[PDB]
């Protein structure tokens, strides 16, 4: 058995795809990971497991996404160039020790099924977003692109709870058509994989599994932090942002008392405005903080803000070893844009969050953080503008550090570590679902 693994070319999709492959290798399955050449020349390959990489093309080997004329051009070029480049990996390996038997492609790339079917291969999409989010999208697809509020099977959800495509009308029309066209052919899939575990959205997994065979194979957080069954899986080893020489960071955090630091980070792709950046900077400077401002975003922090940094309470970085930060006892709360990987990381580490979602599926994750998992609070935004003002930010941070919702939320969230380990340990639902997939593949 041999699996070709095709992530969407961003950090948030690549690392679950890699981590999943480490589990496949642990279970005796050969995997080749298909990176775009733009990405492959942007990686800095320090590994934490055996890795086999094949290169494919999205049609932007030189400049990547930012050189495309439009988002919708990128997707269609990606389909054309990606279909050819993926086919060639399959062809080339046919006469080899292990010809490929299964394509595990990102759900954002449904055309990979066509390629998988043309070579008689097993095909399974891989959803990097939670069951709740995708079931919402699925219900729109079997509709014709909009949704019945309230959702009869999940009626506690409102307009501000939905993905940004619904509440910001007309925004990202091409990206909106992508998340819906995840379902154009998923019927024909041999299985459907989602980077979640059953006990985290037990309800919403059921709803979605009525329509399609869903196999939860998360969480994709490295084995060392949970189940420890995979000795080599110590961290995230395919990173698009250079690694700071990260022990400066983790040494600084063992300097500070337990639960004293506020961690701030917005993922790999989210861009705030100048206005957004000073409201944050003021609210956060009321605290001992660790803030990740990526390099493309230093522009928009206040004039001379990085000088005014109190070096005895707080620190600003271009990027961070987020896994090790969230495992560090000096963190008190995590101010997060609610990217799915970041949310599952904070839940697994028992770090309560201040949710400050920005777009696509982050509003849903923020609702579940506050009202389903009761593991954090959503910051309030002025409705004219969608911007969180410095005092609404500071209010929310204090509610998770000092309020006494704060020690209730503190204990509600520590439930999840042990649930996640149980699913990754022998006989867990995730460990069982991975075995069903491995069974099919050979
Ligand atoms: O400074 C940082 C910020 C983020 N991350 C990692 O980058 C991923 C971010 O993906 P996520 O799903 O949170 O959001 P997206 O980045 O896709 O918008 C997560 O695994 C984080 O652990 C990191 O390692 N250092
Ligand atoms: C879409 O817009 C969000 C905020 O609205 C920004 O974070 C992204 O960079 C952009 O693609
Ligand atoms: O990379 C992501 O996380 C993503 C998620 C939803 C829609 C578009 C995207 O690029």
Method: X-ray
CA distance 263 to 191: 37
356 is annotated as contributing to ligand binding: no
Asked whether the beta carbons of 58 and 77 are under 8 A apart, the reply is: yes
Q: Are residues 40 and 74 in the same domain?
A: yes
339 is annotated as contributing to ligand binding: yes
Residue 87: what are its φ and ψ, rounded to 5°? -45, -45
Burial of 335 (0-12, 13-18, 19+ CB in 10 A): buried
CA distance 343 to 353: 8
322 is annotated as contributing to ligand binding: yes
CA distance 103 to 192: 12
Q: Are residues 320 and 372 in the same domain?
A: yes
Among left, alpha and beta (phi > 0; psi -120 to 50; other), residue 170 is left
Closest ligand, as measured to the CA of 358: 2
Q: Which residues are bridge partners to 261 per DSSP?
A: 331
Question: Which residue in the block uniquely carries the two structure tokens 């990027």?
Answer: 319
Residue 1: partners with Cβ closer than 8 Å, 6 or more residues away: 28, 29, 30, 98, 101, 102, 438, 441, 442
CA distance 357 to 336: 7
Q: Which residues are bridge partners to 53 per DSSP?
A: 33
Per-residue three-class SS string for the chain: CEEEEECCCCHHHHHHHHHHHHHHHHCCCEEEEEEEHHHHCCCCCCCCCCCCEEEECCCCCCCCHHHCCCHHHHHHHHHHHHHHHHHHHHHHHHCCCCCCCEEEEECCCCHHHHHHHHCCCEEEEEECCCHHHHHHHHHHHHCCCCCCCCECCECCCCHHHCCHHHHCCCCCHHHHHHHHHCCCCHHHCCCEEECCCHHHCHHHHHHHHHHCCEEECCCCCCHHHCCCCCCCCCCCCCCCCCCCCCHHHHHHHCCCCCCCEEEEECCCCCCCCHHHHHHHHHHHHCCCEEEECCHHHHHHCCCCCCCCCCCCCCEEECCCCHHHHHCCCCEEEEEECCCHHHHHHHHHCCCCEEECCCCCCHHHHHHHHHHHCCCEEECCCCCCCCCCCHHHHHHHHHHHHCCCCHHHHHHHHHHHHHHHHHHHCCCCHHHHHHHHHHHHHC
Residue 87: partners with Cβ closer than 8 Å, 6 or more residues away: 115, 118, 119
Among left, alpha and beta (phi > 0; psi -120 to 50; other), residue 338 is left
Closest ligand, as measured to the CA of 337: 1
Enter the tokens of residue 415: 């439930």
Among protein residues, the one whose CA lies closest to atom 6 of ligand 3: 360
94 is annotated as contributing to ligand binding: no
Domain, as residue range, for 309:
229-422
Q: Are residues 254 and 292 in the same domain?
A: yes
C-alpha of residue 342 to centroid of ligand 1, in Å: 6
C-alpha of residue 8 to centroid of ligand 3, in Å: 9
- The CA angle 339-157-385, to the nearest 5 degrees, is 65
Pocket probe for ligand 3: among 7, 8, 359, the residue whose CB has the most ligand atoms within 8 Å is: 8
CA distance 256 to 416: 25
Nearest ligand 2 atom, CA 266: 7
Q: Are residues 74 and 149 in the same domain?
A: yes
Query: Which value in Å is the resolution of this experimental model?
Result: 2.6
Nearest ligand 3 atom, CA 179: 7
Choose among 347, 348, 349, 368: nearest CA to 357. Answer: 368
321 is annotated as contributing to ligand binding: yes
Enter the tokens of residue 288: 């001992």
Q: Which residues line ligand 2 (CB under 6 A)?
A: 269-271, 358-359
Q: Are residues 154 and 260 in the same domain?
A: no
- HSE at residue 35, side-chain half, CA atoms within 13 A, is 19
Q: Which CATH number fits the domain that encloses residue 298?
A: 3.40.50.2000
Nearest ligand 3 atom, CA 8: 1
CA distance 368 to 361: 11
Q: Are residues 392 and 417 in the same domain?
A: yes
Q: Are residues 407 and 434 in the same domain?
A: no
Enter the tokens of residue 91: 């062809």
Among left, alpha and beta (phi > 0; psi -120 to 50; other), residue 321 is beta
Question: Which residue in the block uniquely carries the two structure tokens 């020790």?
Answer: 97
Structurally, how many domains does the chain consist of?
2
Peptide bond into 219 cis (omega under 30): yes
Burial of 52 (0-12, 13-18, 19+ CB in 10 A): middle
Choose among 145, 210, 191: nearest CA to 436. Answer: 191
Asked whether the beta carbons of 373 and 355 are under 8 A apart, the reply is: no
Burial of 295 (0-12, 13-18, 19+ CB in 10 A): exposed
C-alpha of residue 269 to centroid of ligand 1, in Å: 9
338 is annotated as contributing to ligand binding: yes
Among protein residues, the one whose CA lies closest to atom 11 of ligand 2: 270
353 is annotated as contributing to ligand binding: no
Q: Are residues 235 and 129 in the same domain?
A: no
Question: Which residue in the block uniquely carries the two structure tokens 């959800």?
Answer: 157
Q: Is 240 in the pocket of ligand 1 (CB under 6 A)?
A: no
Closest ligand, as measured to the CA of 359: 2
Question: Which residue in the block uniquely carries the two structure tokens 């600084």?
Answer: 252
Asked whether the beta carbons of 294 and 318 are under 8 A apart, the reply is: yes
Q: Are residues 200 and 297 in the same domain?
A: no
Burial of 415 (0-12, 13-18, 19+ CB in 10 A): middle
Q: Are residues 224 and 234 in the same domain?
A: no
CA distance 207 to 281: 41
CA distance 103 to 267: 27
- The CA angle 306-307-308, to the nearest 5 degrees, is 90
Q: Are residues 1 and 143 in the same domain?
A: yes
Nearest ligand 3 atom, CA 267: 3
Q: Are residues 265 and 221 in the same domain?
A: no
Residue 46: partners with Cβ closer than 8 Å, 6 or more residues away: 237, 243
């Amino acid at each position: 058995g041999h699996v070709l693994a095709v992530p969407y070319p961003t950090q948030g999709h690549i690392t679950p795809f890699r981590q999943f492959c480490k589990r496949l290798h642990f279970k005796g399955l050969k995997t080749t990971l298909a990176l775009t050449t733009f990405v492959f020349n942007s990686i800095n390959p320090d590994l934490s497991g055996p890795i086999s990489i094949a290169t494919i093309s999205d049609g932007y080997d030189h400049g990547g996404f930012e050189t495309a004329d439009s988002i919708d051009d990128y997707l269609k070029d990606f389909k054309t160039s990606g279909s050819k480049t993926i086919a060639d990996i399959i062809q080339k390996h046919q006469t080899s020790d292990n010809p490929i038997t299964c394509i595990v492609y990102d759900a954002f790339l449904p055309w990979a099924l066509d390629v998988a079917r043309e070579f008689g291969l097993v095909a399974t999409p891989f959803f990097t977003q939670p069951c709740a989010v995708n079931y919402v999208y699925y219900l729109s697809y079997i509709n014709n692109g909009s949704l019945q509020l309230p959702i009869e099977e999940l009626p506690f959800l409102e307009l501000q709870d939905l993905p940004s495509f619904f509440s910001v009308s007309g925004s990202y029309p091409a990206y909106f058509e992508m998340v819906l066209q995840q379902f154009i052919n998923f019927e024909k899939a041999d299985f459907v994989l989602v980077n979640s575990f059953q006990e985290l959205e037990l309800h919403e997994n059921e709803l979605w599994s009525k329509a399609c065979p869903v196999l939860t194979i998360g969480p994709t957080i490295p084995s060392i932090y949970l189940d420890q069954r995979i000795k080599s899986d110590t961290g995230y080893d395919l990173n698009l942002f250079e690694s700071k020489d990260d022990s400066f960071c983790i040494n600084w955090l063992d300097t500070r008392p337990q639960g004293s630091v506020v961690y701030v980070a917005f993922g790999s792709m989210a861009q705030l405005t100048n206005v957004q950046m000073e409201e944050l900077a003021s609210a956060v400077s009321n605290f001992s903080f660790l803030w990740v401002v990526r390099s493309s975003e230093e522009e928009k922090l206040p004039s001379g803000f990085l000088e005014t940094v109190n070096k005895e309470k707080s620190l600003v970085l271009k990027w961070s070893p987020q896994l090790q930060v969230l495992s560090n006892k000096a963190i008190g709360c995590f101010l997060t844009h609610c990217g799915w990987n970041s949310t599952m990381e904070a839940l697994t580490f028992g770090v309560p969050m201040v949710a400050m979602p920005q777009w696509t599926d982050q509003p849903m994750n923020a609702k579940y953080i506050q009202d389903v998992w009761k593991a954090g609070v959503r910051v309030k935004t002025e409705k004219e503008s969608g911007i969180a003002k410095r005092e609404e930010i500071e209010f929310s941070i204090k509610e998770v550090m000092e309020g006494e919702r704060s020690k209730e939320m503190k204990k509600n969230v520590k439930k999840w570590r042990d649930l996640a380990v149980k699913s990754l340990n022998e006989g867990g639902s995730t460990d069982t679902n991975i075995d069903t997939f491995v069974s099919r593949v050979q």
